């Protein structure tokens, strides 16, 4: 039980809105929300995210890297630098992005910019856990 | 008349809204229409000196712009494709050019015969 | 110190790097709202 | 008062209320627009306070435009800067907008820090906000606590300043009501002093 | 005025003086939207001559009308058009000023003279484009064109 | 003629130059100078009442300033300046004055000496 | 008009009077930049008299330049110096603003004397901007620079 | 100038074509603010007659706000309230056009001659909604209000 508010700063996906439990891509595995959980500040690495309703509905969503907070009492908000839903994402159109990425970590005998690239790999591989 | 009658109303209409022109780059792509159509319009109003126009080549040459068919064709040119698309009909379909001017009006096929002048040769104009 | 770090590189370019790909992820009945967003608008004056 | 003059004159006026009354609608569109991209930034920007605002910070130890013309907008980060540059330690000059340049560099020319441009033109989205706290770490300040204020909108007649504060040191972030929370990492706050900050910047350009 | 009204009937060619424009030092101060000649017909001094002068009209023109925008309202608040045309206008105007032999006395500078030609492609320069890089005072009271690119490293270092 | 031949068109100039870019802009760097120079120039004609000058005295000022050695001080001392520059150099040189008010002109001489009892005042007051 | 224009010629001091200025309820109306005497002169009112004149009369004088762009774009246009200028001289204007003993019945208030030591000291100190933190009412209809910046108060 | 001023001392009422108003089609082409009559006293008339003027004016003046709003703000921008005022006043704008006699010849269009009483009521319905429901184009260019109802019906 707890008024769970998610949006970014193009749209507002959920407003204070009655949930029970959500779901999200932490900087260490997954972390679940308890309906009443311990205080706690970490921030995200990009995946996928499910929300469970207050009638039980469960849509999936998908987050790029931001914010979640979870307050002492009994409220939790994700803020997201990019949140796509519904259909947007065009199959694995992305999946070739995969590439011109992994294939780029060569190219570069760098570390600056090398150390941006590998990110986009895991980001955009772990994309493809989509459709 | 019947291609005056638009020009007056459209130029009108330009005048409204010319003060955006300068201070109107970036406004509703409807207004930024009669700009255009009107700096055309206005472009076809300007002419030389002791060069007066039969009436048919006016009403052609009005009917071009007064249409849209200009609206693609950069302010400066106009004055010369107005020039040369004159010509072309004078000399060639001095045919129904010629026949627009003793019928009178613009025929229902007097219509379509131009706009097959206008935009076919527009085309190759600006090419 | 992490995957990304180590060089000196914030968080931020981590977050923004992200979005890169999301926005690379989509079609043409909805991007009308990723490509309007976005941007640096901004100068960097210390001339 | 000669004919040829009160002519002049009149001319002259009858322009200035035309670009005015032209420019007028220029803005207008684009404060509809603004509005309407604000309706989501607001609720986002908010929520990125809703921890900060649910357990205050003490600490032992400027945002607008470059487009003037809107009157009552520049002055008021100024009633609130030159009027809090003689308040506060040391803070150095760190506002976007060009237009402060302009009403704050014959009377305060030194602490400057580091100026932006191009704030207005083009309706400012997230990158913009990052791109100048990316700007607070790479430029290494030494950080200690956050003065960023900027004009909350209320209405198309009225807005009103605000100063907010963000904690710019994540030791002073860091501090004593704050363990109300669980694994303070200072690498995953670190991660979200951050964040958080080009999480401010951004709902105060908005 | 019922005197000068009258005489402009009488006349060919009329060079009319303004004190606006001598005001700014611009001297000789003729107006060069209310000086008029008959014989400026391109089938008399040619389409290049012609299509030339009636540009440098043009622009001296579109500039005078932006005049009560930019000094009133922010000057960069002008389109990228216009900040050009307000440029070489500037430029074109001040290029229009001429040193008189007998005004070194007023002026300060050695009389001087230009060929017809010399006038036509000057401007049909400044006009194309071709000096938006050298600053405004170098047009300012000098001869043939030239003697313009001369001032605009006597001014520079 | 020295001081003030070409001075006359530059005060008709740099008036309608600061009267352009009246407002807190940007401006290339041929015409940053001229503004930052006039406002002391003016500073100059400012004169009392009843209290002439003879055209000695007003040619040792008016160099003050013209060779630019003003082109650096606040104008709201302007006039203490002068007021001092000019007794200072009436009572320590009759020598200067005394050619210039009789040959009236400046030889590369009497400039000379000048040249050196100006800037002996500008670094002995603010530097 | 003839009449008025070639009066002038005549006086020694002159005091004009503005509609304009009345209409500001500003009694009584003089006009500050249009009335003068052939006296106003430091050998003859001594240089501070002379010094403090003139020093208003510039401020005002450079109030009414401004007079045109302030009723165009409007006070926030105004340079930061300007905004002050306005400020400063607005309080001079209504300084000069002093409640006779006759119209005690159209100004209600009690009828004010000024002698010359607290004119010129008054002033000198609202030029000298002593005062820039009192509100505009509180010189307009009053005595010596006391009662101003006494007014100032009751409002607060 | 005196040739107007001495000639609208003789003049009880104006009747105002407008170029402007005959654009948006309506016929005849007053200006229903611009033209005006001395003998809109209630005293003179009735104090319906009066008070239903006085309406179709307010109306009237309100709507060509909402008309720069509208312009630039937003087409819904307005309340339930103003979306209504709105409504009312484009309806009421149509219901001021009228067939002339004189125009039958050449509109086929017959022509209404509208006794007072009616085209007081008229007014005072369309005022007090009495037509929200009804369209809008049925009250351009008709005789009495039961034309408009009674075309309204033979829109099918």
Same mark, same amino acid.
């Given at each position: ?131 | ?127 | ?47 | ?81 030159? @009027? ?5 330690? %040391?803070? !150095?000059? +760190?506002?976007?907008? *060009?237009? &402060?340049? /302009? ?51 209320? @209405? ?5 300043? %605000?100063? !907010?504060? +963000?904690?710019?040191? *994540?030791? &002073?972030? /860091? ?32 | ?157």
């Amino acid at each position: 039980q707890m008024s769970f508010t998610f949006a970014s700063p193009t749209q507002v996906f959920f407003n204070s809105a009655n949930v029970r439990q959500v779901d999200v891509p932490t900087q260490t595995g997954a972390f679940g929300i308890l309906a009443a959980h311990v205080p706690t500040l970490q921030v995200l690495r990009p995946g996928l995210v499910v929300v469970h309703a207050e009638d039980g509905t469960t849509s999936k969503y998908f987050v790029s890297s931001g914010s979640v907070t979870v307050n002492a009492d009994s409220s939790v908000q994700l803020l997201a630098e990019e949140a796509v839903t519904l259909d947007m994402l065009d199959l694995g159109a992305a999946k070739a992005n995969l590439e011109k990425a992994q294939s780029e970590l060569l190219g570069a005998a760098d570390e600056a910019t090398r150390a941006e690239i590998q990110i986009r790999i895991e980001a955009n591989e772990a994309l493809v856990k989509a459709l | 008349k019947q291609v005056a009658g638009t020009m007056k109303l459209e130029l009108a209409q330009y005048r409204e809204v010319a003060a955006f022109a300068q201070f109107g780059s970036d406004l509703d792509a409807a207004t930024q229409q009669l700009l255009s159509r009107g700096v055309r319009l206005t472009e076809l109003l300007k002419q030389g000196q002791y060069s007066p126009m039969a009436i048919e080549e006016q009403v052609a040459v009005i009917y071009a712009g007064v249409r849209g068919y200009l609206d693609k064709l950069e302010p400066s040119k106009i004055t010369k494709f107005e020039n040369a698309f004159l010509s072309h009909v004078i000399s060639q379909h001095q045919a129904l050019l010629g026949k627009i001017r003793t019928d009178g009006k613009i025929s229902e096929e007097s219509d379509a015969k131009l706009k097959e002048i206008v935009t076919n040769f527009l085309a190759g104009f600006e090419a | 110190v992490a995957y990304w770090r180590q060089a000196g590189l914030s968080y931020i370019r981590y977050s923004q790097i992200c979005a890169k790909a999301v926005r690379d992820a989509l079609k043409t009945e909805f991007k009308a709202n990723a490509m309007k967003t976005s941007g640096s608008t901004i100068k960097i004056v210390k001339v | 008062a000669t004919l040829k003059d009160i002519t002049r004159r009149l001319k002259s006026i009858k322009n200035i209320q035309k670009i005015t009354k032209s420019m007028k609608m220029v803005a207008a569109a684009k404060y509809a627009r603004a509005e309407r991209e604000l309706k989501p930034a607001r609720v986002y920007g908010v929520g990125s306070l809703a921890l900060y605002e649910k357990a205050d910070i003490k600490t032992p130890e400027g945002v607008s435009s470059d487009r003037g013309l809107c009157g009552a907008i520049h002055s008021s980060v100024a009633k609130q800067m030159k @009027s809090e540059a003689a308040n506060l330690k %040391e803070v !150095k000059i +760190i506002g976007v907008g *060009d237009k &402060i340049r /302009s009403i704050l560099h014959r009377t305060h020319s030194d602490q400057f820090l580091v100026t932006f441009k191009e704030v207005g033109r083009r309706p400012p989205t997230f990158g913009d906000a990052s791109v100048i706290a990316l700007e607070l770490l790479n430029s290494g300040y030494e950080f200690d606590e956050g003065s960023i204020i900027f004009n909350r909108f209320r @209405s198309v007649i009225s807005y009103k300043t %605000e100063e !907010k504060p +963000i904690f710019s040191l *994540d030791t &002073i972030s /860091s501090a004593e009501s704050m363990s109300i929370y669980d694994d303070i990492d200072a690498d995953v706050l670190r991660n979200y002093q951050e964040y958080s900050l080009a999480n401010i910047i951004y709902y105060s350009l908005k | 005025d019922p005197a000068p009204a009258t005489t402009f009937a009488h006349l060919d060619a009329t060079t009319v003086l303004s004190r606006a424009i001598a005001e700014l030092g611009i001297y000789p101060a003729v107006d060069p939207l209310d000086s008029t000649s008959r014989i400026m017909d391109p089938n008399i001094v040619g389409s290049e001559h012609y299509d030339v002068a009636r540009g440098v009209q043009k622009i001296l023109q579109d500039y005078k009308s932006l005049q009560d925008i930019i000094a009133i309202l922010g000057m960069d608040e002008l389109s990228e058009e216009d900040k050009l045309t307000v440029s070489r206008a500037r430029k074109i105007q001040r290029f229009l000023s001429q040193p008189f032999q007998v005004a070194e006395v007023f002026t300060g500078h050695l009389g001087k003279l230009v060929p017809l030609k010399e006038t036509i492609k000057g401007f049909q320069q400044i006009l194309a484009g071709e000096y938006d890089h050298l600053p405004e005072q170098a047009f300012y009271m000098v001869g043939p064109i030239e003697e313009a690119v001369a001032k605009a490293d006597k001014l520079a270092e």
